[PDB]
Design a protein around this ligand. Sequence first.
Ligand SMILES: Nc1ncnc2c1ncn2[C@@H]1O[C@H](COP(=O)(O)OP(=O)(O)O)[C@@H](O)[C@H]1O
Ligand SMILES: Nc1ncnc2c1ncn2[C@@H]1O[C@H](COP(=O)(O)OP(=O)(O)O)[C@@H](O)[C@H]1O
Ligand SMILES: Nc1ncnc2c1ncn2[C@@H]1O[C@H](COP(=O)(O)OP(=O)(O)O)[C@@H](O)[C@H]1O
Ligand SMILES: Nc1ncnc2c1ncn2[C@@H]1O[C@H](COP(=O)(O)OP(=O)(O)O)[C@@H](O)[C@H]1O
Ligand SMILES: [Mg+2]
Ligand SMILES: [Mg+2]
Ligand SMILES: [Mg+2]
Ligand SMILES: [Mg+2]
Lengths: 258, 256, 257, 261
Amino acid sequence: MKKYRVQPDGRFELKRFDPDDTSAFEGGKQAALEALAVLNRRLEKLQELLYAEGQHKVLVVLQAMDAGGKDGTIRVVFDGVNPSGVRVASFGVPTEQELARDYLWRVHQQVPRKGELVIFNRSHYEDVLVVRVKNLVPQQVWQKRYRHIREFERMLADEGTTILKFFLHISKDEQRQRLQERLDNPEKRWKFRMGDLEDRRLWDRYQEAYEAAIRETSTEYAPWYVIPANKNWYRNWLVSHILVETLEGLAMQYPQPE
Amino acid sequence: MKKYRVQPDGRFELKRFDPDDTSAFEGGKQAALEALAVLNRRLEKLQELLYAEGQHKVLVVLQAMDAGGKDGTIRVVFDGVNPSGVRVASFGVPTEQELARDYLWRVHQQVPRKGELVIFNRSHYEDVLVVRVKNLVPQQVWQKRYRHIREFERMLADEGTTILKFFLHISKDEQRQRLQERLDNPEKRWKFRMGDLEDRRLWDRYQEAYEAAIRETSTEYAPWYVIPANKNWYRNWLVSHILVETLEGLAMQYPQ
Amino acid sequence: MKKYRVQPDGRFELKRFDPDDTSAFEGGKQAALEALAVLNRRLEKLQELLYAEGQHKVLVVLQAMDAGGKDGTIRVVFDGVNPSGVRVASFGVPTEQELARDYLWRVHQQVPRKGELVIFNRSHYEDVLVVRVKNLVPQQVWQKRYRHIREFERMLADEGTTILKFFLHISKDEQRQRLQERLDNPEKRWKFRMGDLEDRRLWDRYQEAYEAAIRETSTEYAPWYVIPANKNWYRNWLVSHILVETLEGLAMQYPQP
Amino acid sequence: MKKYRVQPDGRFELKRFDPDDTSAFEGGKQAALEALAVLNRRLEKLQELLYAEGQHKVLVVLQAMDAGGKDGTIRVVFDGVNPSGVRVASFGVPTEQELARDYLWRVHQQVPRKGELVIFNRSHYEDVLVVRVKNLVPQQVWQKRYRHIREFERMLADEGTTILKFFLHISKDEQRQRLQERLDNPEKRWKFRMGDLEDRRLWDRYQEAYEAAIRETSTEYAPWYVIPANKNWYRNWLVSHILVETLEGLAMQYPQPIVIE
Ligand SMILES: Nc1ncnc2c1ncn2[C@@H]1O[C@H](COP(=O)(O)OP(=O)(O)O)[C@@H](O)[C@H]1O
Ligand SMILES: Nc1ncnc2c1ncn2[C@@H]1O[C@H](COP(=O)(O)OP(=O)(O)O)[C@@H](O)[C@H]1O
Ligand SMILES: Nc1ncnc2c1ncn2[C@@H]1O[C@H](COP(=O)(O)OP(=O)(O)O)[C@@H](O)[C@H]1O
Ligand SMILES: Nc1ncnc2c1ncn2[C@@H]1O[C@H](COP(=O)(O)OP(=O)(O)O)[C@@H](O)[C@H]1O
Ligand SMILES: [Mg+2]
Ligand SMILES: [Mg+2]
Ligand SMILES: [Mg+2]
Ligand SMILES: [Mg+2]
């Protein structure tokens, strides 16, 4: 089941992962939806424990190509989970205030507190992704940032944060369909930006960047999971299974005051 | 259904509201749960519109006595609503940093942005509630805050925030049972502090403080709704109905 | 010198104030520099006592036209005052994050804490100034802001903030010279933006905007002082005098051992 | 100077530094005050350039024992420097909100922005000092924190922050006098807390904690300077000299960009 966990050997190659792979589930969509429903209930209970224990901090990082399933994952995986204990932090185009400080400043501000589960919809990884691909800074600058991230995450983990980093892996062809579906969708007509067409020619450069990022930052304290995300049902089930298992591993207990 | 909206006539009496009242729903639990399921789906859709339109700011304020149903309301009313568009801000015991600035500073920081629905689990109201009851500041101070709160909410509303204030009204006897269940439940035991028994002795002063605040701060731009909260099913349905109707009233539309 | 405090009668008139007026000081520059040196020393001591007492919050609001002397006031008036107790908060062009919430959100965040003296270099007033002049929101919206401002400042004052609002009043002709002097000084040329010229075309609308804000928001708890700011030496001495006297009035005492 | 810069060799021994040392200055009190006046003027001009250029991020970290001269340094070194470009961030006893996140969260929030000079009056170092001495977390937990700091400061420096860390070194005897003077002074008594006598009792444990911290975190990108701080005049001149020289080294330039009618 950890066939998707990227080992900290620095020997990662994205070619080994197929976006269309569904080998960890034996049953197809209908069966998987039932399985997800079970895990969602366990997740709801596990969050209730987390909030009650108030010791651990859970950080779920979502990274994907545009239309890679970031919003869809949050919406389906965290369906019915208490709003008081779960929070989404999105990282968009940096403001002048954000650029006036190091790139980790805006990110560090949003980290989960004790008893809180935080989802990062894009993250500090963007500073080794869009920044690298579009050469917003030279290689000399962004190359050093891998060490920064390893060390920043070491600090977070050592101080009590459970870090789960999910790479939602979709094919170039799947993305083409999803963006075309976005353009014909009336309630998604607004989600489209013109820049989505320029980043499309940069596909390979983005894939190279994801390969580099994952190889350099997947550690035992902060592992990367490559989720085959072409099938939404499989993506949702697998992300739920990984999170539920990790949270189960924490052996969280309800406190007693006497 | 707006028999629960507190009119801005400064003539409200809490006396007139029974925590055990269920008169706005023509039936019981089983039927009300079905009704809530329908409103929850509408709520999910209305939030989706809010986030997409990205113009309005929605502020839901929850105030209640301890074990009055604040966590329960958030959990049930907002079940299945997109986490990206909904946020809870809890107000606890003020820190030294928080006390070093005016009481509205910590609260103003958490207000909803455009396209966001924020729930305040306890609020700036505590500064005319626990503060008043325990005399954490003298009367001279906390008396002036009613005007502050009216004017701060006028500003929020004028600048595009839809404000819904819910008072979850439970009986002294219901609280006694709920707190006893907290002591008799291992998965509830944790929410308990010894101070929950002390505040119990201050019941009437807290009730007097709630009546006072609601009378002073329920306005046309920021109304107070007194929710009979003894029955969870009725509490959840009624808060959902009021929220859904208010959000419907905004005539929100998806962008072109 | 109470001749500069704008009474809360709602009958303020900016034509009654001359930027070139120096009548409150019985002398010129050389004598005023000496007088300012005395007040600056008292200000340094008063700040030490504010920080020590740790109860009051002091908010100094500076509003002026471009090249009206806001930065020079900070630099000279607060010279030698302990950095640990004094802070500047500047308000610029609002970000999308700042615009996504009410206009008072970014301003409320910067308010002085207990024992702190804060200077606002531009403020929440901007939201009834540049916003009004350039119609960034309609009249329907910015008209209601005067009440918001009065009530927000009432709340700050009631809760322990001493509020001093200074309008640094310069003439249209003085601004023309200063802006020209900016374009000629290499260590100042960087402060120049093309907008400084576009806003100069809007002089009168800005003046009308200042008369309206001052008339509407000068209260007992938060007064406005119209400082004739054409002469730097007079501007610096008069703001120092007003601040020092206000701080003296607080009769601040050292904590009980 | 490089005699006070702590080399990144991990062989630092605080015993090699005398709080009463004044060897870098030839002239005594009167001559040093004149020298400081000159450096203060250069500092004022250098800050004006920093704010105008708006590219560099400057972080001055002040660490000292109680009554070690932190407030005194800020007050004298930064005298007359424009408030708009200089900010003090003090770190006291953590709040429940601050404790609910990692210890670097509150500190990272206060880092200088572009064109700003920030002074940290106590810092993230407190989390390997008072925390270590009073065992507010176990050794297993605070031991890992040296690497965190090295790496956090590497990130800050790599991304554009000039980091100056000053350890204001006073003797046990000097502290005893200053604490007593605070007590007898009516305009200083207010600074006193009962814990000042507890942080006096643990002197050696604190000194051992400063030795370990400085030894572990003085790097090329973020050096530690041990300032002999028994003499205020020498302390003030030396911190001013180090800061001015560092700022001079940045070779800051004013930006480059019509008849007004
Ligand atoms: N560090 C960064 N530097 C530059 N651009 C960034 C950075 N972080 C995020 N971005 C960009 O910001 C954009 C956010 O777009 P937005 O529409 O707000 O979100 P979404 O990914 O849901 O479409 C992304 O296209 C992303 O590449
Ligand atoms: N302004 C305030 N001043 C003093 N106490 C406050 C203030 N606001 C909130 N509190 C108190 O903080 C406490 C928060 O308690 P906590 O257990 O964290 O939440 P809950 O109400 O869910 O039990 C409440 O008992 C409340 O009375
Ligand atoms: N509320 C506001 N809305 C719009 N513009 C604003 C607002 N507050 C400030 N501004 C503008 O931001 C600009 C800040 O410019 P800047 O160069 O950073 O400062 P300075 O006034 O020292 O030149 C001013 O020209 C001012 O008109
Ligand atoms: N990380 C921390 N953990 C515990 N105590 C801390 C921490 N950071 C700072 N402190 C303590 O906070 C206190 C600062 O408060 P105060 O007496 O008002 O000022 P000062 O440092 O000027 O003496 C110091 O005693 C210091 O040890
Ligand atoms: Mg509780
Ligand atoms: Mg409680
Ligand atoms: Mg300027
Ligand atoms: Mg002290």
